[PDB]
Amino acid sequence: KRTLLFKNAELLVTMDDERREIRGGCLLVEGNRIVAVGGDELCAAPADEEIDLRGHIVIPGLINTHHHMFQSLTRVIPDAQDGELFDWLNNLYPIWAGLTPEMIRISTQTAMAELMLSGCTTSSDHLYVYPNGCRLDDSIDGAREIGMRFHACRGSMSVGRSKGGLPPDELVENEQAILEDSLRLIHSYHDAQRYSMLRIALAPCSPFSVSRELMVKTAQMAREQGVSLHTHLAENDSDVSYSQTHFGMTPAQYAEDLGWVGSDVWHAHCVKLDRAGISLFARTGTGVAHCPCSNMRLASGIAPIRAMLDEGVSVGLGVDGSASNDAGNMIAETRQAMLLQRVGFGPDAMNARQALEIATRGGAKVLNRDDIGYLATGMAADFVAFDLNTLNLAGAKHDPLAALVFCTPGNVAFSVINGQVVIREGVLQTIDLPSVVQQHNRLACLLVN
Amino acid sequence: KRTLLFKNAELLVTMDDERREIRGGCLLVEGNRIVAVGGDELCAAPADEEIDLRGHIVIPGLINTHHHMFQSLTRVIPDAQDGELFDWLNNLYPIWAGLTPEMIRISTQTAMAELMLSGCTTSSDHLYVYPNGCRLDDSIDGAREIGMRFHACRGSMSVGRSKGGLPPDELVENEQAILEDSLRLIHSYHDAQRYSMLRIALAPCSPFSVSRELMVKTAQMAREQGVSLHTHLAENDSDVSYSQTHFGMTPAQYAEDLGWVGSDVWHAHCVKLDRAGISLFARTGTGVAHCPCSNMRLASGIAPIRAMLDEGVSVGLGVDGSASNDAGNMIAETRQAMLLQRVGFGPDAMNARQALEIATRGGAKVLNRDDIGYLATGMAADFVAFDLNTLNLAGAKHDPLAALVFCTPGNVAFSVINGQVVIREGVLQTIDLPSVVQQHNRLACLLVNRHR
Numbered sequence A: 001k002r003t004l005l006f007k008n009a010e011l012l013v014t015m016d017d018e019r020r021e022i023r024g025g026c027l028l029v030e031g032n033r034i035v036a037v038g039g040d041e042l043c044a045a046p047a048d049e050e051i052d053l054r055g056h057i058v059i060p061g062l063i064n065t066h067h068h069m070f071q072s073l074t075r076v077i078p079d080a081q082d083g084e085l086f087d088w089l090n091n092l093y094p095i096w097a098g099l100t101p102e103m104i105r106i107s108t109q110t111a112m113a114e115l116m117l118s119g120c121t122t123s124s125d126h127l128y129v130y131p132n133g134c135r136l137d138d139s140i141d142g143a144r145e146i147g148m149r150f151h152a153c154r155g156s157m158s159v160g161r162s163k164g165g166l167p168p169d170e171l172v173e174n175e176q177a178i179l180e181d182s183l184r185l186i187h188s189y190h191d192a193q194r195y196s197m198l199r200i201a202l203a204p205c206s207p208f209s210v211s212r213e214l215m216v217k218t219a220q221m222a223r224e225q226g227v228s229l230h231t232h233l234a235e236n237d238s239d240v241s242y243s244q245t246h247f248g249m250t251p252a253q254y255a256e257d258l259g260w261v262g263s264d265v266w267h268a269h270c271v272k273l274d275r276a277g278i279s280l281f282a283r284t285g286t287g288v289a290h291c292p293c294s295n296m297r298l299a300s301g302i303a304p305i306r307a308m309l310d311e312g313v314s315v316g317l318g319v320d321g322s323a324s325n326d327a328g329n330m331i332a333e334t335r336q337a338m339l340l341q342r343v344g345f346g347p348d349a350m351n352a353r354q355a356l357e358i359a360t361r362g363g364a365k366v367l368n369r370d371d372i373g374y375l376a377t378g379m380a381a382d383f384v385a386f387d388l389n390t391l392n393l394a395g396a397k398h399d400p401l402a403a404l405v406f407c408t409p410g411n412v413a414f415s416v417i418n419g420q421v422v423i424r425e426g427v428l429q430t431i432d433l434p435s436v437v438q439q440h441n442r443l444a445c446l447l448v449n
Numbered sequence B: 001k002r003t004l005l006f007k008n009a010e011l012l013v014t015m016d017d018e019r020r021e022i023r024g025g026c027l028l029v030e031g032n033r034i035v036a037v038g039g040d041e042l043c044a045a046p047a048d049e050e051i052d053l054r055g056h057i058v059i060p061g062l063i064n065t066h067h068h069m070f071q072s073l074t075r076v077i078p079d080a081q082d083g084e085l086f087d088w089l090n091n092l093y094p095i096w097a098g099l100t101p102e103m104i105r106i107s108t109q110t111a112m113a114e115l116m117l118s119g120c121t122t123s124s125d126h127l128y129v130y131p132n133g134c135r136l137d138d139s140i141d142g143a144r145e146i147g148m149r150f151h152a153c154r155g156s157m158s159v160g161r162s163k164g165g166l167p168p169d170e171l172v173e174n175e176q177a178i179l180e181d182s183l184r185l186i187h188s189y190h191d192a193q194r195y196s197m198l199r200i201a202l203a204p205c206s207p208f209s210v211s212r213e214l215m216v217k218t219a220q221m222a223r224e225q226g227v228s229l230h231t232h233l234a235e236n237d238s239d240v241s242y243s244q245t246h247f248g249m250t251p252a253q254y255a256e257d258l259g260w261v262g263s264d265v266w267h268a269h270c271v272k273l274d275r276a277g278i279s280l281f282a283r284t285g286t287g288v289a290h291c292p293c294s295n296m297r298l299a300s301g302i303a304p305i306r307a308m309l310d311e312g313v314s315v316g317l318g319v320d321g322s323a324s325n326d327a328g329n330m331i332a333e334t335r336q337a338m339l340l341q342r343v344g345f346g347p348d349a350m351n352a353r354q355a356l357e358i359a360t361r362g363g364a365k366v367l368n369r370d371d372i373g374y375l376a377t378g379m380a381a382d383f384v385a386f387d388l389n390t391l392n393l394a395g396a397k398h399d400p401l402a403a404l405v406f407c408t409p410g411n412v413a414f415s416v417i418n419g420q421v422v423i424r425e426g427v428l429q430t431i432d433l434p435s436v437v438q439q440h441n442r443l444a445c446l447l448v449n450r451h452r
């Protein structure tokens, strides 16, 4: 098996069980997994390829736990730039009706490229529209070319505007079709073993877009098949009122009532989750995908992340779809989580290591994976390296780790995913990025005009 | 004098009085000023050099209205990353006591380089510590090397621990020395003419950091000499309580009491300004430097920027010192101003164009300048260009202007300051940037390992 040695990192951040931060640290990789982590004599190890990381910080690859990568074709749509969750959706649904399988394939690559160059090695997605013959398969095809570790969610909507829901009737599907497609996707694509590069989750989009019947059946199938469940929960005030008006419950009560609690569940946003819901999630092991830029750009609110963490809730990080961020920058999202918790809850609400922990270990937890998220023997060989001698970080070498969260670094210098060196000296190796960006912009023009 | 044609920008954002956004726009420059703004008809203009901006957006240069560039040597100090503001100041003051003139010279260039590469063409600074023979002259020297348009503030502190303050016995100066140095700096450096590359302002660190007498003479000297006044005001709950307890008035009332209102005054932060203070600033023309990343990173609060703007207060943008941000990224700070206003006050509190106006015209206004901040005939030739065909902006060409605020672009592709092309295809031209960064980190190492 192919061996790879990364040697002489200025700081090697492990996020391991001792949270070791090794000066001069070295990483030895074999195949897709880590052999050993340390300094000293391990740096003298021969290997099939050695890469010198002097002047760089190495961290575990960041883990993105919420996205809508198809929306990277529709950033800053003029009619959608100003306004809240509902109304924003109302202006964007008509544009998304034009999506083709090619747009799904290319936009998965574009969004994934932006995430990979900003430090991310594992991401989920939440594709929930399937017009014009689009399939989750098209997104999987693109994810396979670019080499990122992928948790593909079969998103869905069934309750159109005629039935008391939000999406237009054209963009929703029949619930039996959804369940059959979900089962097909699991059987064809879900790899449940260690170091898997592709897993499937089931993800009805939100309580205002799907029936409770589909929520229960989806959960039943996921438990039967051994896969996770994902949805939007308590994103803003309208979300909370809709659930109170239509179902007589808080979003947390509604989730538990449907079986959507447990370590195989993770909810996006949870901005308006109440103290009772936080305790419920803590005791059931239910996960949260925190999306701070989205929560700001849509004026959703400040999620009570510090309160969730203090009760033992599992919190990961997500950029959300690029029509509500509108960036796809993972390390910048980690910075935002620190800044927003501090402005919301005080100077002790979130430091650099706590935010980075959410962005790594927290993401592994909410995706229900124990093989990513930190660097130790037997873990997946997923990590990135930032050049510390850039202008962006000048004067911040007093703490190379905090520098990534308190400053605004550029792209990663190196990225390793599943043992593959996918980024080399700032250059994405697995696709022709200028060509994909070029195609992406042509398709985006086609989609909107 | 040298002439320059920038042609065929995908979108040329002028921020002029009609807020023209010109498809295919062109800019004709002579010396330090804009000769014409228009479309392809400008391509028949002769020029010493043509620069093709196809695929790029051009905007007016961003204007930074608050900084402490010396702190770029002391980012993420472990003792100061977390904790309360008392611990922030108390742990950083002893380190800044080691600052040398060379450190001031170099860190000005480092901080200005980060600002310039992120879209900024004019900045103020607020140097308020002068140990070991450091002088505002040293930062002026570094700014002249890099070519940025510069509003250098003679910051000051006089109230040390002996008089109930925080800084050590000294970072604080004798109050007569401060004024004599202030007058010297004005006489030696302040250039009051149009297109000036250097202006001086007087900037006690806060109204509580100097005697009431010093606040008053300083304002008197500034008015006599025709220069502006700058300070920290109403940054947090402690400032409001101190001034209400100790002086019996709100910070804005105390500012009015000292003569620190007027169009030649701009106050940093103003996070905790009340409705009455907002009205006072609106009618006196007093400016605000809004610093969103610092206000979050130090847990100060959300400044009521939308309320200030609705009342007619002049608001600019600032990154603040690099120990309280800790980035020096101007376009990211413009994004943050939008994001933070929306989460504080709702989806109508700030759009991309309103945020970009604050970052350009708003900064020009609070610096009391009518020759920068937008692109029109006779305005200073200060503008930057971002490549629209990058990964970062992929799928955002539906609105090239909003893309700069809603996405996270990389460095500018081109920057022109006072007619000089200071950045060319992403490369800073006026200094050897890798060498300056090397010196900067070496000096930062020396500074933190000093005996104290």
Ligand SMILES: [Zn+2]
Pocket (backbone or CB within 6 Å): A066, A067, A068, A126, A232, A268, A320, A321
């Ligand atoms: Zn979402």
Ligand SMILES: [Zn+2]
Pocket (backbone or CB within 6 Å): B066, B067, B068, B126, B232, B268, B320, B321
């Ligand atoms: Zn300041």
